[PDB]
Amino acid sequence: KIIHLTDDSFDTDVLKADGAILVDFWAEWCGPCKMIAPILDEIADEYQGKLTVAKLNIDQNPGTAPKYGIRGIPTLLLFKNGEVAATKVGALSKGQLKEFLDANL
Amino acid sequence: MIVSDIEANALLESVTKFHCGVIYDYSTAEYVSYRPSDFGAYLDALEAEVARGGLIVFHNGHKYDVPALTKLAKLQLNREFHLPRENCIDTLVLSRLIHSNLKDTDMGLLRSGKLPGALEAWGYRLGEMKGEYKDDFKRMLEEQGEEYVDGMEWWNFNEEMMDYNVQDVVVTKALLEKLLSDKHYFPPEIDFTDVGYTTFWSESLEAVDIEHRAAWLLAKQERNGFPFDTKAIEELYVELAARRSELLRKLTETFGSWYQPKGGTEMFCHPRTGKPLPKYPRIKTPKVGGIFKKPKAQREGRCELDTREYVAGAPYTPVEHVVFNPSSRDHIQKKLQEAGWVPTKYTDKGAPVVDDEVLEGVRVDDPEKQAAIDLIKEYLMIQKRIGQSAEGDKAWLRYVAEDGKIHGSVNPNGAVTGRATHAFPNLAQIPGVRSPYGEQCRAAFGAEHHLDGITGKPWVQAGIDASGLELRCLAHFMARFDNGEYAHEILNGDIHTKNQIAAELPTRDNAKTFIYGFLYGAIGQIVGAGKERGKELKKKFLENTPAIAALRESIQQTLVESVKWKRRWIKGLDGRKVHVRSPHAALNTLLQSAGALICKLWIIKTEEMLVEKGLKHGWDGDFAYMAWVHDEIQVGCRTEEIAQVVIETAQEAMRWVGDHWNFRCLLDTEGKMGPNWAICH
DNA sequence: GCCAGTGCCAG
DNA sequence: CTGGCACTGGCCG
Ligand SMILES: [Mg+2]
Numbered sequence A: 001k002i003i004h005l006t007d008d009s010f011d012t013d014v015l016k017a018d019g020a021i022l023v024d025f026w027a028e029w030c031g032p033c034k035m036i037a038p039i040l041d042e043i044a045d046e047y048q049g050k051l052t053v054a055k056l057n058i059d060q061n062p063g064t065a066p067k068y069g070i071r072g073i074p075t076l077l078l079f080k081n082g083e084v085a086a087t088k089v090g091a092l093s094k095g096q097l098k099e100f101l102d103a104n105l
Numbered sequence B: 001m002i003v004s005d006i007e008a009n010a011l012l013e014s015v016t017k018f019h020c021g022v023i024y025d026y027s028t029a030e031y032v033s034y035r036p037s038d039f040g041a042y043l044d045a046l047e048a049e050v051a052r053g054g055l056i057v058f059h060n061g062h063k064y065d066v067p068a069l070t071k072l073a074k075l076q077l078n079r080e081f082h083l084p085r086e087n088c089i090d091t092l093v094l095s096r097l098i099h100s101n102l103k104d105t106d107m108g109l110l111r112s113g114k115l116p117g118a119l120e121a122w123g124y125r126l127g128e129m130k131g132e133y134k135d136d137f138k139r140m141l142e143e144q145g146e147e148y149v150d151g152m153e154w155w156n157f158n159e160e161m162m163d164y165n166v167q168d169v170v171v172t173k174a175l176l177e178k179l180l181s182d183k184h185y186f187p188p189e190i191d192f193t194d195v196g197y198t199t200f201w202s203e204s205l206e207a208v209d210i211e212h213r214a215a216w217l218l219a220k221q222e223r224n225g226f227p228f229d230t231k232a233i234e235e236l237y238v239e240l241a242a243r244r245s246e247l248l249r250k251l252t253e254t255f256g257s258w259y260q261p262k263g264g265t266e267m268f269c270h271p272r273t274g275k276p277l278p279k280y281p282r283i284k285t286p287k288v289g290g291i292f293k294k295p296k297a298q299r300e301g302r303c304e305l306d307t308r309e310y311v312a313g314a315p316y317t318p319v320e321h322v323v324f325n326p327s328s329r330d331h332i333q334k335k336l337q338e339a340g341w342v343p344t345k346y347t348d349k350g351a352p353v354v355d356d357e358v359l360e361g362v363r364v365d366d367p368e369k370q371a372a373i374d375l376i377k378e379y380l381m382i383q384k385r386i387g388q389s390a391e392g393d394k395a396w397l398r399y400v401a402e403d404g405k406i407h408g409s410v411n412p413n414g415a416v417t418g419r420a421t422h423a424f425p426n427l428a429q430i431p432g433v434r435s436p437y438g439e440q441c442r443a444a445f446g447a448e449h450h451l452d453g454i455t456g457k458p459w460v461q462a463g464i465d466a467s468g469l470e471l472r473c474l475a476h477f478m479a480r481f482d483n484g485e486y487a488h489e490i491l492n493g494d495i496h497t498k499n500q501i502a503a504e505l506p507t508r509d510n511a512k513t514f515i516y517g518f519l520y521g522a523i524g525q526i527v528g529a530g531k532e533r534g535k536e537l538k539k540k541f542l543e544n545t546p547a548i549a550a551l552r553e554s555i556q557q558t559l560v561e562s563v564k565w566k567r568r569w570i571k572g573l574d575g576r577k578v579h580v581r582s583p584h585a586a587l588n589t590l591l592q593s594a595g596a597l598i599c600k601l602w603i604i605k606t607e608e609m610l611v612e613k614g615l616k617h618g619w620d621g622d623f624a625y626m627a628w629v630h631d632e633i634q635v636g637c638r639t640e641e642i643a644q645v646v647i648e649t650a651q652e653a654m655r656w657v658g659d660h661w662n663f664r665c666l667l668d669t670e671g672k673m674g675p676n677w678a679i680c681h
Numbered sequence C: 001g002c003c004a005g006t007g008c009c010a011g
Numbered sequence D: 001c002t003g004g005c006a007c008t009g010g011c012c013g
Helices: A007-015 A032-045 A093-103 B038-049 B061-077 B092-100 B121-142 B157-179 B195-205 B207-224 B231-253 B329-336 B356-361 B368-391 B440-442 B469-482 B485-491 B496-503 B508-518 B534-542 B546-559 B583-612 B642-658
Strands: A018-028 A051-057 A074-080 A083-089 B001-007 B018-025 B030-034 B056-057 B088-091 B258-261 B319-321 B409-411 B419-422 B460-466 B567-571 B577-579 B623-629 B632-637 B671-672
Touching: A007 A018, A007 A051, A018 A032, A032 A051, A032 B319, A074 A093, A074 B258, A083 A093, A093 B642, B001 B038, B001 B157, B018 B038, B018 B157, B030 B157, B038 B056, B038 B061, B056 B061, B056 B157, B061 B088, B088 B092, B088 B207, B092 B121, B092 B157, B092 B207, B121 B496, B195 B356, B195 B496, B207 B409, B207 B583, B207 B623, B231 B368, B231 B409, B231 B419, B231 B440, B329 B368, B356 B368, B419 B546, B460 B583, B460 B642, B469 B485, B469 B546, B469 B583, B485 B496, B496 B508, B496 B534, B508 B534, B534 B546, B546 B583, B567 B583, B583 B623, B583 B642, B632 B642, B642 B671
Parallel strands: A018 A051, B001 B056, B056 B088
Antiparallel strands: A018 A074, A074 A083, B001 B018, B018 B030, B258 B319, B409 B419, B460 B632, B460 B671, B567 B577, B623 B632
């Protein structure tokens, strides 16, 4: 259920999509990114109704991250109607993520 | 004999005031201090020593004290003062000859800590005096609540400056006697502090006289400077900068930017176990932050959102965005391997080698990235030219003086072998005419860029070089074994084709490549093999050239015994000791030193002959030495007629040098007349 | 600011 | 082989 973005599909899959979209900017060499990975898989299932979860590997797709001023990973950007609604950086826990989504959905 | 030193308000180029001077006279065994109003008396005392046919000792006096006194005497007293070369001794020149195996700070111009090996103590102190004085001055000011300014310690005379002046002479005298105690250069039977100048030069080893003559002449050369075309280089800089930018544009398009961990202060530990993971990038664990703000209402007392982006406890990896830098070997390596490149050779530190040779052999699938490698090689070369000519700390454009000339420094005996070293900037490393942009670089250095002080007409350049000096030096040394056979071949027939046959080589060019490398103690890249055929090439060469094998053996038996040495030095042509760093480089040391001393005596004799013919050395005269690059000299001449005379005189001087040291191989020179270094190659 | 590491330019 | 010096990248106050 997780959408794997690319620099070329980002605009249409995220910016011009409907509903809430949670984007995770990550890299294979980051410890925290690997921590939150499993959590994101479970979040995609739960909010399978009112939320779409997408991932963008910054090494394979170097063009997008710079546009949002990434300063650390994992960076979670919540998009709504083509714009960043909320943003949180770090390996949030299952519960913490839940609260973040609930409070912003 | 007297020992002296002066303190003035600036470096030679801009000195305007004599602050003080100190003189130690060996005849009275007393020190005498001269304050600012005693300048005239200071000069009279030096001239009195000259009138006695005496000697004046300075530390670095050839380049500073002597020339500064001439300048200051004219500016302050409207007096003509010119100490003769024969009456002056320089302990820095002596130290560089006797302790040639050691480095020195070049009077504080170089950082002590960056130099390899040990440093002679007295010389170290003399070279650090300015820095110490500045430190004493500074703390004395700050203790008085006064702010220090750039270099105010030299604006006015003061008593602590006088004290440093006295100390300099005390140490210079100590250095002098330490140097004079070396019996290899100074016969013990003679007290060199109690003899006239003629005895001093004639009774000391020949090398002592040659080194002082070389330093006197080269100080003059530095003063002359090399006329430089500033405008042409500024235009070259614009051209190079434009190509650099375009290459960067292309390369940054081909190789995109990426993220790298940076700023991590915490070790990443396994959430499950807890075992540290040093390999993973360092992380950061925010201590503050949450989803909601800490509340302010009954509804919430049982909530406002925290717009901040961090959550206490939730670790992340700090990263920085990096753009491709074509000058970074690390980026180059990173991008090329990602393209499929597989390194074959690394450095002793593990990093893969990224030099022109390996880059040329790199093969990747993507044609754009493959072609980008040429852009990288070109970018690296362009950067090298830009750094040397305009942006580097020692760039030509930063060194050109008001007189439109570059006054590079020369250490007359900076190399262990007796060769000179050049710096600030190094005028012995200007790109050759055959390398990219070499013609423009070379053309910017030339006599044509100096307009005569009277007529306004550009001067002309005479470029003279010693012909195949290294090989002729080899022929000389093998003569006791082949009776001049190699020498006869050099000037009658072809020595390179002769070596080609000797070392079973395919192309004559391979011979020239083989010889000039065999002397450097070197491999098979000449033919295309390596570390296998090479061994066979040496044995075959030495087998068909028995005289060179004999020479090598004789050298060895003289230095080594098993490394356990019997003597770690070779006697140079003028009798000096030449330190041998390694047994394998012994022959190269012998040959390079021979060429160096030959060229040193050659430029000295050439100028003396020009002077005896009536020509005046200087821009206010007939000719001016502008550069000495090991086996060649570039001389500015007021007219073409003079240039022809300089060229012809240089040939006569070389023949005189060969005869002087009974060389077993005839020595020659070749000269060219033109407007600049590009033409006079 | 410095110290290493690497590489290239001259002869 | 003998030298000078430019750049990058890590550490530092
Ligand atoms: Mg002095």
